[PDB]
Amino acid sequence: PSGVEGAAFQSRLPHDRMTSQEAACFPDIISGPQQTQKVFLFIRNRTLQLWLDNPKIQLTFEATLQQLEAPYNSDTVLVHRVHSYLERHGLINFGIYKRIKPLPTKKTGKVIIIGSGVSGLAAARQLQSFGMDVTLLEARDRVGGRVATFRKGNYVADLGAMVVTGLGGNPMAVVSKQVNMELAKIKQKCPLYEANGQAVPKEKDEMVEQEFNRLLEATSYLSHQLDFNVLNNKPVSLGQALEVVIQLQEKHVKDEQIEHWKKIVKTQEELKELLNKMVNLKEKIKELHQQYKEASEVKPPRDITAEFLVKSKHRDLTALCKEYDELAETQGKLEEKLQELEANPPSDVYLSSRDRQILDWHFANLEFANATPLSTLSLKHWDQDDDFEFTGSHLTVRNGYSCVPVALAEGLDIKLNTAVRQVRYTASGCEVIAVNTRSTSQTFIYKCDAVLCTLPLGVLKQQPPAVQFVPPLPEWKTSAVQRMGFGNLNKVVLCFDRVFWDPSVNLFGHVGSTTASRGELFLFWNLYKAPILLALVAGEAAGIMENISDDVIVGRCLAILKGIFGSSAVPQPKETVVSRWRADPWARGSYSYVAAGSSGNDYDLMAQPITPGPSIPGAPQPIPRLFFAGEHTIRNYPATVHGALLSGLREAGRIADQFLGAMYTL
Amino acid sequence: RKPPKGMFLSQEDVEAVSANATAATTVLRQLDMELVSVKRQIQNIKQTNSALKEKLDGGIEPYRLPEVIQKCNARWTTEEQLLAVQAIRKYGRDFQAISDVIGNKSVVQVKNFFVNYRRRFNIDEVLQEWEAE
């Protein structure tokens, strides 16, 4: 899409409808006349287009009104109202831009942010952008959180996020123009290589994949058209539904052989009855012939009865010879039918072990996408974010993704090595209680108007708690934390002194021996300038490889490569790194998933802020003080970076609205 | 509205593979038995029909009789008249047989016969005794 309408699409907004967001701030316009709505909608799209067309410089209200034309620029307050709404919610002037108007010397309001993850940073940025006092508390000695980047010498490899899922309407597209990112496309071609070490031949490779994609749809049909969503009280998982489909396909393969062979018996046995007439008729023919012989052996001249006997017997034998010929006619048809059925047999199996093992690799990929055993994904909801997919090639970051958090952290008050242990929030303010990660006796108290919490869902999940909330988080919040899924997926970094793989292939798979080990080193990436191969550990295997030394893991990786490339061309690796994200206590996992019995609604619960009780009974309802952001709070775009970023932009919006006032809604 | 093409998913079938833990293995095992059950039942009729097939060795080639190609005449030699009455007695009203016995009388010379010589040959009696057997 292009025009002013390309800006709406690139801003994740319908170009010709007001969003629910916008009805909230402009309820005059959306309840008003259709003409007004279109004027508004244009002003919205046009300003977005301006910001988009150049996102390294702030878009001031003046700059906007300048470049609007009548009748669109006839109404200044509509244009002012609209520009501020976009600015507050991070739709324009977000990320890294040169400010025209420098920051107000004195800031109003003070906010603590827990975590300098990408969501943290992005809100910090926006709050400071809005003239607020913003201090971030990071447990790690580095920013970026789950966006981590290994750097040693010329080697560079993300241990954390590494792909940008398409720039169609993706904020990272702005951030990239925004700060140099070496973005390179990811060539879709992935050869598989069985345990033996040889390529799956292309014919099998497409007919397994197609069966995979076909099985997936099958579950979706079980879910939406047969309502197979709850079984024995527990909700059904995707893995369950896949088994019920594979079983019902193995069922059908058998019902199909049975009713085929059962056509053979039903014809073999027509032949049984046909041969019994024919063997009992060759016997009557054997007898009359004897009789007719005996009758024509009474030499003539004879009386007429004795003459009739020869003729009558001759007729009879001719009658029974007609019958026996008509029946070896019929015997020919049935004999031909049996060769037909015994030569077009239906299929022997549903899938063989070679096919099923390959399919298991396609399941390993899906456990990779969702960072969890398919047995835990919600059948009804695992793919509810699939409508909001961006458009375009997926990319990698060849200089490392750390470049983006570091970029964002420029100018922000970041206290590194600072483990928050108690969040304490009351009708009159909050105090956050942290320690120093190095000597943990040394204690820190932070007072603030509001706490924005970007603690990983896995951290929020710890029992017993890594962070105490005082007072406790309400049940509606803590139940949402249990229901939600926080999964795991680790990776291994392999640094060699020479390229020994196909350099025109970005990624190539490895097929596992078992279903149980389908995730174990199932996939490798050539992504970087330097000779670095990067190897995934997904599914049930991820959580088990965290209990196994780096050498053992690296040793297994070499063996798989040896198989595919030969022992001669795969030398021992100069530098090796293995991630342990479930182990890491500042993450306790890799990212969220829609667990069975959860829904996208839990993602919205995670984002509702908390408003504490009145200090003095009878005092009026207080302001909200505890806010949440991060990858697990954006229901439409979970378990990503752009989604983390978006949630940070979001809360920064609603927090400013809270303590700074929303002058755009009149 | 409908499954992917080829994927078989009856609603009825579904319940039957979920009704307990091992029900899915249990239903498949029966079918593996229903399959062996039919499969040797085949070799057993395949065996029985190979026996009945050998008893028909040689067909009926020795028992066949060459063809009387004889031109279908009009007059009724007393010989042919007498073959007729005896054929009526042993063949009822099946003229094709009576025509094939007499050998040179069309099936319609036979019917006419049935009325022309009706009273002289007591066909009513002859026919009613064909009815006796």
UniProtKB/Swiss-Prot annotation, chain A:
Changing K333R: Loss of polyubiquitination. Acetylated by KAT8 in epithelial but not in mesenchymal cells, thereby regulating the epithelial-to-mesenchymal transition. Acetylation by KAT8 reduces KDM1A association with nucleosomes, thereby decreasing histone H3 demethylation, leading to transcription activatio of target genes. The N-terminal sequences of INSM1 and SNAI1 compete with histone H3 for the same binding site and thereby inhibit histone demethylation (in vitro). Changing K491A: Abolishes histone demethylase activity. Induction: Down-regulated during neural differentiation in neuroblastoma cancer. Residues 130-666 are annotated as: Demethylase activity. The modification N6-acetyllysine is found at K262, K263, K266. It is found in: Nucleus; Chromosome. There is a cross-link at K333 (Glycyl lysine isopeptide (Lys-Gly) (interchain with G-Cter in ubiquitin)). The keyword Ubl conjugation applies. One of its GO terms (molecular function) is enzyme binding. There is a cross-link at K272, K299 (Glycyl lysine isopeptide (Lys-Gly) (interchain with G-Cter in SUMO2)). Residues 258-344 form a coiled coil. One of its GO terms (cellular component) is chromatin. Changing S119P: In AIMAH3; uncertain significance. Its cofactor is FAD. Residues 4-103 form the SWIRM domain. Ubiquitously expressed. Keywords: Acetylation, Chromatin regulator, Chromosome, Coiled coil, Cushing syndrome, Developmental protein, Disease variant, FAD, Flavoprotein, Isopeptide bond, Nucleus, Oxidoreductase, Phosphoprotein, Repressor, Transcription, Transcription regulation, Ubl conjugation. Transmembrane segments: none annotated. Belongs to the flavin monoamine oxidase family. It is linked to Cleft palate, psychomotor retardation, and distinctive facial features: A syndrome characterized by cleft palate, developmental delay, psychomotor retardation, and facial dysmorphic features including a prominent forehead, slightly arched eyebrows, elongated palpebral fissures, a wide nasal bridge, thin lips, and widely spaced teeth. Cleft palate is a congenital fissure of the soft and/or hard palate, due to faulty fusion. The SWIRM domain may act as an anchor site for a histone tail. Component of a histone demethylase complex with RCOR1. Component of a RCOR/GFI/KDM1A/HDAC complex. Interacts directly with GFI1 and GFI1B. Interacts with INSM1 (via N-terminus). Component of a BHC histone deacetylase complex that contains HDAC1, HDAC2, HMG20B, KDM1A, RCOR1 and PHF21A. The BHC complex may also contain ZMYM2, ZNF217, ZMYM3, GSE1 and GTF2I. In the complex, RCOR1/CoREST strongly enhances the demethylase activity and protects it from the proteasome while PHF21A/BHC80 inhibits the demethylase activity. Interacts with the androgen receptor (AR). This is Lysine-specific histone demethylase 1A. It comes from Homo sapiens (Human). The lineage of its organism: Eukaryota, Metazoa, Chordata, Craniata, Vertebrata. The gene is KDM1A.
From Swiss-Prot, chain B:
Disulfide bonds: none annotated. Phosphorylated by HSV-1 protein kinases in case of infection. It comes from the Eukaryota. It is found in: Nucleus. Ubiquitously expressed. Residues 24-59 form a coiled coil. Residues 71-122 form the SANT domain. Residues 1-74 are annotated as: Interaction with KDM1A. Interacts directly with GFI1 and GFI1B in a RCOR/GFI/KDM1A/HDAC complex. Interacts with INMS1. Component of a BHC histone deacetylase complex that contains HDAC1, HDAC2, HMG20B/BRAF35, KDM1A, RCOR1/CoREST and PHF21A/BHC80. The BHC complex may also contain ZMYM2, ZNF217, ZMYM3, GSE1 and GTF2I. Interacts with REST. Interacts with the SMARCE1/BAF57, suggesting that the BHC complex may recruit the ATP-dependent chromatin-remodeling SWI-SNF complex. Interacts with SOX2. Essential component of the BHC complex, a corepressor complex that represses transcription of neuron-specific genes in non-neuronal cells. The BHC complex is recruited at RE1/NRSE sites by REST and acts by deacetylating and demethylating specific sites on histones, thereby acting as a chromatin modifier. In the BHC complex, it serves as a molecular beacon for the recruitment of molecular machinery, including MeCP2 and SUV39H1, that imposes silencing across a chromosomal interval. Belongs to the CoREST family. The SANT domains may bridge the nucleosomal substrates and the demethylase KDM1A. This is REST corepressor 1. It comes from Homo sapiens (Human).
